[PDB]
Amino acid sequence: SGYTPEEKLRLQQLRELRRRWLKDQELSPREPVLPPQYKTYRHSIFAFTHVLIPVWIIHYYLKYHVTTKPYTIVEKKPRIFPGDTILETGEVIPPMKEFPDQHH
Amino acid sequence: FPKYEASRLSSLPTTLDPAEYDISSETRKAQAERLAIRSRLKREYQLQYYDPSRRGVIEDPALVRWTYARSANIYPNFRPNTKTSLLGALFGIGPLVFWYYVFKTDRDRKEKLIQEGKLDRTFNISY
Amino acid sequence: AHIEPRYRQFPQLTRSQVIQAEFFSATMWFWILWRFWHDSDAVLGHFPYPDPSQWTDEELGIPPDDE
Amino acid sequence: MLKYIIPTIMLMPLTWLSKNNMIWVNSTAHSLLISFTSLLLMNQFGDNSLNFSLLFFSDSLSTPLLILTMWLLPLMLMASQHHLSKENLTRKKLFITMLISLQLFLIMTFTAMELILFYILFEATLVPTLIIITRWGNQTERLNAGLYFLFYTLAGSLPLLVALIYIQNTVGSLNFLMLQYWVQPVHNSWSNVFMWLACMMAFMVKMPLYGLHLWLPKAHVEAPIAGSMVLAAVLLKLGGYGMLRITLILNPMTDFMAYPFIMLSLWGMIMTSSICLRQTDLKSLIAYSSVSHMALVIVAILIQTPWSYMGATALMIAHGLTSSMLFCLANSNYERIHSRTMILARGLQTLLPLMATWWLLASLTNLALPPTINLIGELFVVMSTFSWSNITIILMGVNMVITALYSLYMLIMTQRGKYTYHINNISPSFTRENALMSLHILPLLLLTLNPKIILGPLY
Amino acid sequence: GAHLARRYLGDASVEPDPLRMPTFPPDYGFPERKEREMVATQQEMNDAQLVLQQRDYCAHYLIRFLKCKRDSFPNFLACKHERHDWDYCEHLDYVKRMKEFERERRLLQRKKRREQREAD
Amino acid sequence: SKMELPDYKQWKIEGTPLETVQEKLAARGLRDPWGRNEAWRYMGGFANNVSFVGALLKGFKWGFAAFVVAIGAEYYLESQ
Amino acid sequence: NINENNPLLINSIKRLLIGSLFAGYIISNNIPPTTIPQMTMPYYLKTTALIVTIL
Amino acid sequence: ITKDMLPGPYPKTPEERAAAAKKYNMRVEDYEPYPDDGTGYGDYPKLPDRSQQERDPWYDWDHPDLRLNWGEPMHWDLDMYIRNRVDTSPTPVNWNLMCKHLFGFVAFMLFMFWVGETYPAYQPVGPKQYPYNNLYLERGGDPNKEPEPVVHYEI
Amino acid sequence: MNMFSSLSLVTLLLLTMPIMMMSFNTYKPSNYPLYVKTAISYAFITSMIPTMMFIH
Amino acid sequence: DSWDKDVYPEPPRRTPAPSPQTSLPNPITYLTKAFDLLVDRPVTLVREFIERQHAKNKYYYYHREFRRVPDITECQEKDVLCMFEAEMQWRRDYKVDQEIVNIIQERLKACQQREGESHRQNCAKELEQFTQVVKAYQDRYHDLGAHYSARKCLAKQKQRMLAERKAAKEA
Amino acid sequence: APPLTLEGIKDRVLYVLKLYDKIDPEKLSVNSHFMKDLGLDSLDQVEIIMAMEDEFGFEIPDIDAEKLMCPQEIVDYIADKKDVYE
Amino acid sequence: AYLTHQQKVLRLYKRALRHLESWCIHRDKYRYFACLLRARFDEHKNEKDMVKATQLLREAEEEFWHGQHPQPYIFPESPGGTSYERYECYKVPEWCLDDWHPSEKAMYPDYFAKREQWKKLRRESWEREVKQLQEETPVGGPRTEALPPARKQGDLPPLWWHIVTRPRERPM
Ligand SMILES: CCCCCCCCCCCCO[C@@H]1O[C@H](CO)[C@@H](O[C@H]2O[C@H](CO)[C@@H](O)[C@H](O)[C@H]2O)[C@H](O)[C@H]1O
Numbered sequence A: 001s002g003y004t005p006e007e008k009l010r011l012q013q014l015r016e017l018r019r020r021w022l023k024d025q026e027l028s029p030r031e032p033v034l035p036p037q038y039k040t041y042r043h044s045i046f047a048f049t050h051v052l053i054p055v056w057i058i059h060y061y062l063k064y065h066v067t068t069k070p071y072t073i074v075e076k077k078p079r080i081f082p083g084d085t086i087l088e089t090g091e092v093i094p095p096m097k098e099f100p101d102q103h104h
Numbered sequence B: 001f002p003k004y005e006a007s008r009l010s011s012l013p014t015t016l017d018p019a020e021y022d023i024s025s026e027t028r029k030a031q032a033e034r035l036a037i038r039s040r041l042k043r044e045y046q047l048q049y050y051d052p053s054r055r056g057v058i059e060d061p062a063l064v065r066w067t068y069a070r071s072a073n074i075y076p077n078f079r080p081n082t083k084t085s086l087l088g089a090l091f092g093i094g095p096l097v098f099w100y101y102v103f104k105t106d107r108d109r110k111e112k113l114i115q116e117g118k119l120d121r122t123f124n125i126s127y
Numbered sequence C: 001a002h003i004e005p006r007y008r009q010f011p012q013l014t015r016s017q018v019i020q021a022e023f024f025s026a027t028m029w030f031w032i033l034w035r036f037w038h039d040s041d042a043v044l045g046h047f048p049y050p051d052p053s054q055w056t057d058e059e060l061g062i063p064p065d066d067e
Numbered sequence D: 001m002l003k004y005i006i007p008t009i010m011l012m013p014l015t016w017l018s019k020n021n022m023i024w025v026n027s028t029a030h031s032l033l034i035s036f037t038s039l040l041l042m043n044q045f046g047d048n049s050l051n052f053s054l055l056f057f058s059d060s061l062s063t064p065l066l067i068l069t070m071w072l073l074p075l076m077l078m079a080s081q082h083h084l085s086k087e088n089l090t091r092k093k094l095f096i097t098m099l100i101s102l103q104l105f106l107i108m109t110f111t112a113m114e115l116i117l118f119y120i121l122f123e124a125t126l127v128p129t130l131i132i133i134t135r136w137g138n139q140t141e142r143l144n145a146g147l148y149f150l151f152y153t154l155a156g157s158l159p160l161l162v163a164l165i166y167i168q169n170t171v172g173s174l175n176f177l178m179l180q181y182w183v184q185p186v187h188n189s190w191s192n193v194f195m196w197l198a199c200m201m202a203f204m205v206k207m208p209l210y211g212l213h214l215w216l217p218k219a220h221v222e223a224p225i226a227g228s229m230v231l232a233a234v235l236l237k238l239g240g241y242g243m244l245r246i247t248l249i250l251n252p253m254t255d256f257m258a259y260p261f262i263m264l265s266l267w268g269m270i271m272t273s274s275i276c277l278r279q280t281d282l283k284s285l286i287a288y289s290s291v292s293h294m295a296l297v298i299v300a301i302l303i304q305t306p307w308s309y310m311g312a313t314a315l316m317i318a319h320g321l322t323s324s325m326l327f328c329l330a331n332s333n334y335e336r337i338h339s340r341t342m343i344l345a346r347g348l349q350t351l352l353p354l355m356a357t358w359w360l361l362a363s364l365t366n367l368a369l370p371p372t373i374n375l376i377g378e379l380f381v382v383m384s385t386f387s388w389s390n391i392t393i394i395l396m397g398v399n400m401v402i403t404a405l406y407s408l409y410m411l412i413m414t415q416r417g418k419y420t421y422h423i424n425n426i427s428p429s430f431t432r433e434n435a436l437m438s439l440h441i442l443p444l445l446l447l448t449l450n451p452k453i454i455l456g457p458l459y
Numbered sequence E: 001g002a003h004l005a006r007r008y009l010g011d012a013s014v015e016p017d018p019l020r021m022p023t024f025p026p027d028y029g030f031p032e033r034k035e036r037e038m039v040a041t042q043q044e045m046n047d048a049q050l051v052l053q054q055r056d057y058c059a060h061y062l063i064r065f066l067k068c069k070r071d072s073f074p075n076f077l078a079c080k081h082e083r084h085d086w087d088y089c090e091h092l093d094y095v096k097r098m099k100e101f102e103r104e105r106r107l108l109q110r111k112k113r114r115e116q117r118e119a120d
Numbered sequence F: 001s002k003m004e005l006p007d008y009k010q011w012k013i014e015g016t017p018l019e020t021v022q023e024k025l026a027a028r029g030l031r032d033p034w035g036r037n038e039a040w041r042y043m044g045g046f047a048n049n050v051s052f053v054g055a056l057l058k059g060f061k062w063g064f065a066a067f068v069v070a071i072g073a074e075y076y077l078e079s080q
Numbered sequence G: 001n002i003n004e005n006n007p008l009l010i011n012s013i014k015r016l017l018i019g020s021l022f023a024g025y026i027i028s029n030n031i032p033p034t035t036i037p038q039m040t041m042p043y044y045l046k047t048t049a050l051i052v053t054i055l
Numbered sequence H: 001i002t003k004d005m006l007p008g009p010y011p012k013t014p015e016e017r018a019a020a021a022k023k024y025n026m027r028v029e030d031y032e033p034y035p036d037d038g039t040g041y042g043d044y045p046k047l048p049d050r051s052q053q054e055r056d057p058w059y060d061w062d063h064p065d066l067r068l069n070w071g072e073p074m075h076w077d078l079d080m081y082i083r084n085r086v087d088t089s090p091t092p093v094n095w096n097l098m099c100k101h102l103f104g105f106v107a108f109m110l111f112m113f114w115v116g117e118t119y120p121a122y123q124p125v126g127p128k129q130y131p132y133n134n135l136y137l138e139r140g141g142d143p144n145k146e147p148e149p150v151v152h153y154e155i
Numbered sequence I: 001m002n003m004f005s006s007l008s009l010v011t012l013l014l015l016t017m018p019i020m021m022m023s024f025n026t027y028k029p030s031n032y033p034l035y036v037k038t039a040i041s042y043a044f045i046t047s048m049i050p051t052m053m054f055i056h
Numbered sequence J: 001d002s003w004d005k006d007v008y009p010e011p012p013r014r015t016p017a018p019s020p021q022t023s024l025p026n027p028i029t030y031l032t033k034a035f036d037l038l039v040d041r042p043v044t045l046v047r048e049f050i051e052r053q054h055a056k057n058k059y060y061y062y063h064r065e066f067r068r069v070p071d072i073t074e075c076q077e078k079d080v081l082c083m084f085e086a087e088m089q090w091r092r093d094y095k096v097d098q099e100i101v102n103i104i105q106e107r108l109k110a111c112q113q114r115e116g117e118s119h120r121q122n123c124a125k126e127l128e129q130f131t132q133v134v135k136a137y138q139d140r141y142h143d144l145g146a147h148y149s150a151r152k153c154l155a156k157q158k159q160r161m162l163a164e165r166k167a168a169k170e171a
Numbered sequence K: 001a002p003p004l005t006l007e008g009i010k011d012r013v014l015y016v017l018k019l020y021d022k023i024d025p026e027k028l029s030v031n032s033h034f035m036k037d038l039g040l041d042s043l044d045q046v047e048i049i050m051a052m053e054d055e056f057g058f059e060i061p062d063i064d065a066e067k068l069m070c071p072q073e074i075v076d077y078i079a080d081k082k083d084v085y086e
Numbered sequence L: 001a002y003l004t005h006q007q008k009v010l011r012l013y014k015r016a017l018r019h020l021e022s023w024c025i026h027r028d029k030y031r032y033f034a035c036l037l038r039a040r041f042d043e044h045k046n047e048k049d050m051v052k053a054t055q056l057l058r059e060a061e062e063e064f065w066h067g068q069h070p071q072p073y074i075f076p077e078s079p080g081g082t083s084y085e086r087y088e089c090y091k092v093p094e095w096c097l098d099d100w101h102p103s104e105k106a107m108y109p110d111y112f113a114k115r116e117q118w119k120k121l122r123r124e125s126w127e128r129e130v131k132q133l134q135e136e137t138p139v140g141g142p143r144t145e146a147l148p149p150a151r152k153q154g155d156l157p158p159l160w161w162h163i164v165t166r167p168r169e170r171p172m
């Protein structure tokens, strides 16, 4: 069932050529012939250029442009609980009424 | 072993097709000349595909026939008959009349409700 | 490189990779045992389930069948 | 408008008096300068249009179309100068003259204040377009394509001429400002049914309307690249622009006269999107894509709501830049393999990486990826059609599914897969070709930042 | 639970219908029922921005827990006692609803007896 | 750098489930001629693998010991 | 050729391993309550998930 | 190509059937036009309706991705049968049986969901009770109407 | 509000900077993958500050 | 500040005072101080510099006032010169009314966010004001079509006024 | 992966055959024809190719496999498919 | 069918072994059942009546279809496998190097010097390859897709370029 002698011979001759071709794909020592052309400090300039400069720009943008227009930044108002003291007015929020203080 | 029931989208495996087996000298003759046509077309292609001086596209007449057969050759071979007219009427006029009554009926209902005040449009001011 | 392939043989291992795997496998079981000790309720039930058939008719205000 | 008409005319002496080796450099440079000054048209007011004289006016509808028209002339020159390189010098100058004369008729068509002046210029564009297709097309079928283009248009235009003259006789004026104040309602009658049809059929053929679209796959395929760029980007929008203006004088009859044409469009787009799935010719696929998109414009114009007019205006501009870019992309392949068959050259992303990026960006805009102005227009039209009838969401939704399939099918078939082995002349993309692609996509994507200038008068 | 087996595979005429319960007067069989007491005022729940589903009869314990949570930040393990107080209160609320279901069932049982005996 | 493969004479089915297969085949009068090609999978560091129960209990020994040590510390920390 | 000794591989999985152990506990104990957790039920409803998993 | 090599009309005579088969690089025995029903096929050969996914992967196709050879007649529906689209390869389970089991599973699950909606599961618990006339004011009730009082008692 | 709003936007802006650098030829493609990974790690840190304020 | 508080109202702010019940340090407190020093301060100085430049070049711009012209009600039919002015006026008032509905919608959205879980009751005034303004806007401008005009608006009003007369006639 | 070599491939091809109980490991050489020299049949050859697929982790199509009748042919086929040139 | 009876039985053997291996999974269990399956094939090895042999093959195929694995094992790089055609996007034809800019070619002066020699070797051999094919092909074209070797010294096997210079299986 195997190869015929003609089949074997053609494979033999292609094989020599293919292996020579693959060998020629190897790069020479000088190639490629390029044309003319520690963590802390490395991590510091990243924080500077990617965190501080952007937050500077964004804070300036929000503080003097976005927040000077109505309803651009809308916060949910703080939760007020009994016993809290309001900073704006100093009003003291009354405590809740006495519980049955039942425990279990 | 329940037998294989071929479908349009689930073809019959060759290993279960009787035509594959019980081969005759007449079938082996057909295969030989089928393989000849493929071998002759392969040689014609390879002689161009391997030509060092060829730079371009190897024009394939089979591809040209295919794109031409599915465009320019259709009307010359068209005949208005019972099959084409019924199909043309069904798939050309059919859907248009259908969607007309769907939208006309739906829009007539809506207009009637709006006239009487029974359609809620409380916040509808964009259209 | 640091590790070379072997033929039909169990591969080479580093001490670091084996120790770290054991430590995090052990840390998993400490966590489960630690939480189970302090939080068995979250797995078994936080509160008793009353047996409704144990409630008296006067608790539920079911009047006598006469009146 | 003389500050644009006169310099556009002066392009003709410039081309004819140029050195034989500078006709493309000079015309391209100076058509870009005209394109620059067209931005002065964006002095638009909230209430009043910009009315220059008794002849010409500009409003938020005509202004973006004018800016698109004057921008396309430079791009058509770069796209053409490769395949006309061997052409005789005087025939090269005539080719440029046809493009310039086409621009002149277009910028006057979009700004003519009187409808009969609009009609004459609307019709005058046929001549240069017909000459471009039949003289400088490549195939035998270009002659037949010109005949279909000519007689499909004229069969609708001639009834329009009679209708307009009848309207002037009875109203006394065709000036569009006058028609805004002297308009009277159209009451039902068989006489008015045919006035309505004569006022709308010329514009429907240009769009084109489904059923009357057969001229476009022929014409958009047989034309040279520049001819296809203007046909898809601008000339199809003469139909949409005309409808947007004349529907003013057709109310309330548009209420029931729109039904047959809304049905043709709603179903037409699904039919013409499905056609694109089984198209074997890349240019033909793109052409059938234009029919699908312009079906939305027809529906938006007919239902006549503030949102649909904004959406229609955005779609016309967005489609112009996208469809033009796709023809140019397909032409670059054709200039390499000299065939329009889509399956012929595959896996091109492997051989032409940057040009595969343009293919992707063009495909994404075509399938209306948000927030592109293609999506903005297509979404506004869907919003208003839903109100017109909720069930239309089913047809709009299906079309959006099919449109993505053929947009990415074209991208996958040509750019992905394995390269065809025997095609060995795929040279690297030229600077001209890369610049031509980026001059479509970059303005198209920039407009997303400021979309209000392409939303028309009802913004 | 078994209650479903009784209502679906058994006789649903003597089984509470969860959608329509209660079907008897509150005071039937209960001479002088106390009215449930609410500790937290409407304004207090409003100012605490409780979720409406959380503004039940145990809301006063929830307010204490939320206040403790804020004041103990970042110690996210404090306020355990406050959380339990709220959890226990909700357990007692749930038990009450269980009793209301048993009372409804026992009355529907009685209403059948008082109809069968009368019927015969 | 030639990869020296282990000597092939060391792979033997004796003492592996492959030997059981050969005995069940020997009863019917058959042989398994590829058994020695599979033997490396039942030999060396691949012999004896954890069960599914053992796999889950990886690290349970040290984790439990830490747990025992931790509660002792916590317990006495409360008492004192 | 088995080899899992690259630090990129180890560190990336190690962080998600710490997450798969404690992240659920941290998040649950820091998120505010927004419902009424239903903590009363029969034993067979409480342990259902645990039992069917073991089976 | 020249006009003699392009597709033509339906072949009427055996001499035209032999010319068409030669034109399409087919054996006259294997050449079969579509039926002449006026649908526009002409003499384009009718080839078996099988996906390209069904062809031999290991053969040296001139177009390996398409699994076509240069010059062989392409199926009329070639673009529908590329490996990205319609697949016709044999299935381990018969098509009709496949449909029965899929539909049967879906229909049964839909039926069982309807049953489960008729006999819902729930706990033996009375309705949850809320204060202040059932949170009438909180839920957006009108403050200018006194609501139908809702009273909840102890138990 | 100023810190919460400011920090919750730098997170989103931080993630686009590798995209802007790549698209605007101002990067050292030596170890771009490490650059992108580093930016994500820093976004996570800045995103924790708004979350802690919400938790509080 | 910059906008009118009356057009864009905001209830008084009530922030509770810190009441730490833990010995631990609050990370947010020290993060806030770092933010003020490293972000707010340098940003503020850069702005104060820019404001020093804007004070050296102070110049003004004005809000256009439009005198009232006769409405389309006063225009003789087909008198384009008077129709044009009335039509332009009507279009100016149409755009302004669109922005009025936007102001009322922006109040409503701000209230919903500000009130948190209590919005359903604490934003009933803004809901009512939004409902009334949207009703008025719908009456003026709804269903006019893309080719709307003062003439069409008048016809819509007259049709509405006629129905109101008839309904009263029933009473 | 660690690159293959012609000597590397040959060693493993012979390694597998030496673990096949129907081949004498002393009469075996890279040139031994499976039928003529080693006395195997075709059913055996299918198993040998199946064992080389498992060994090197890739499939050899049946049309190719049936023609590999000596260990050298298997070595040559594998090196060709894996671009091994040494 | 162009496969002999032998090739069909041998193919069925391998296919059934692979599907058996997918069911068994464990190597020892597979070895046990692979030998029972081999015994079944050996039981009719000498069947002489071609008619009875063909019927045996027909039944075996019917049995294989009934018992095949619905999800058999596929080698990752085999057709249908999870790595099939994974690297086709990295295979770039060699002719693309002719379009490289000179500044790109100057980076690999040694590589492109060898490349020129290969292109020279392709030109100078082409005519002999065409002539050899012409003179060994019977009238009416070839009957098979087989190709001859080179018959002389210095002759290259006809139609070799795209076999020898095809992209590497792992190009990048
Ligand atoms: C927050 C909780 C932290 C809990 C941390 C608990 C301490 C961490 C323990 C790390 C274990 C390191 O030690 C590791 O243990 C395993 C199991 O015994 C040892 O494995 C042991 O059994 C196997 C087989 O039974 C032998 O092959 C091995 O020689 C033997 O030492 C490893 O050789 C050793 O390296």
Ligand SMILES: CCCCCCCCCCCCO[C@@H]1O[C@H](CO)[C@@H](O[C@H]2O[C@H](CO)[C@@H](O)[C@H](O)[C@H]2O)[C@H](O)[C@H]1O
Residues within 6 Å of the ligand: D188, D189, D190, D193, D257, D260
């Ligand atoms: C793509 C093609 C689309 C085709 C669309 C077809 C639209 C058909 C519109 C039909 C309505 C025409 O408008 C209709 O004309 C007739 C004229 O006879 C008018 O009616 C007038 O003539 C009819 C006689 O037939 C009398 O009944 C009536 O007393 C008289 O006033 C109607 O008052 C008017 O409603």
Ligand SMILES: CCCCCCCCCCCCO[C@@H]1O[C@H](CO)[C@@H](O[C@H]2O[C@H](CO)[C@@H](O)[C@H](O)[C@H]2O)[C@H](O)[C@H]1O
Residues within 6 Å of the ligand: B096, B097, B100, D188, D255, D256, D257, D259, D260, D261, D263, D264
């Ligand atoms: C090519 C695709 C073909 C698809 C089929 C499309 C069929 C389209 C038929 C055109 C419309 C015909 O039906 C049209 O309905 C509208 C109402 O909506 C009528 O409109 C008129 O009558 C209505 C009441 O009937 C009155 O309010 C008013 O006098 C006027 O609106 C038209 O008199 C009638 O002609």
Ligand SMILES: CCCCCCCCCCCCO[C@@H]1O[C@H](CO)[C@@H](O[C@H]2O[C@H](CO)[C@@H](O)[C@H](O)[C@H]2O)[C@H](O)[C@H]1O
Residues within 6 Å of the ligand: H100, H101, H104, H105, H108
């Ligand atoms: C834990 C899982 C929880 C969800 C369980 C859901 C169960 C869903 C069961 C759906 C069963 C539907 O599938 C049903 O099977 C039988 C058996 O083949 C089919 O019946 C078929 O098989 C045999 C022949 O091979 C014959 O009985 C019959 O001639 C044929 O139709 C039914 O036509 C099909 O309707």
Ligand SMILES: CCCCCCCCCCCCO[C@@H]1O[C@H](CO)[C@@H](O[C@H]2O[C@H](CO)[C@@H](O)[C@H](O)[C@H]2O)[C@H](O)[C@H]1O
Residues within 6 Å of the ligand: A042, A045, A046, A049, A050, A053, A054, A057, I021, I026, I027, I028, I029, I030, I031, I032, I033, I034, I035, I036, I038
């Ligand atoms: C509207 C934008 C507002 C913010 C504008 C701020 C612009 C500041 C840009 C600085 C440089 C950005 O672009 C890029 O940054 C990274 C990090 O420094 C550098 O990348 C460097 O660090 C990273 C990781 O630390 C390494 O993976 C990489 O090998 C190295 O080159 C690039 O060399 C530089 O080109």
Ligand SMILES: *C(=O)CCCCCCCCCCCCC
Residues within 6 Å of the ligand: E001, E002, E004, G044, G045, G047, G048, G051, G052, H121, H122, H123
């Ligand atoms: C009754 O309480 C309604 C609950 C509906 C089904 C819940 C499923 C619980 C199964 C209990 C069996 C015990 C096995 C752990």
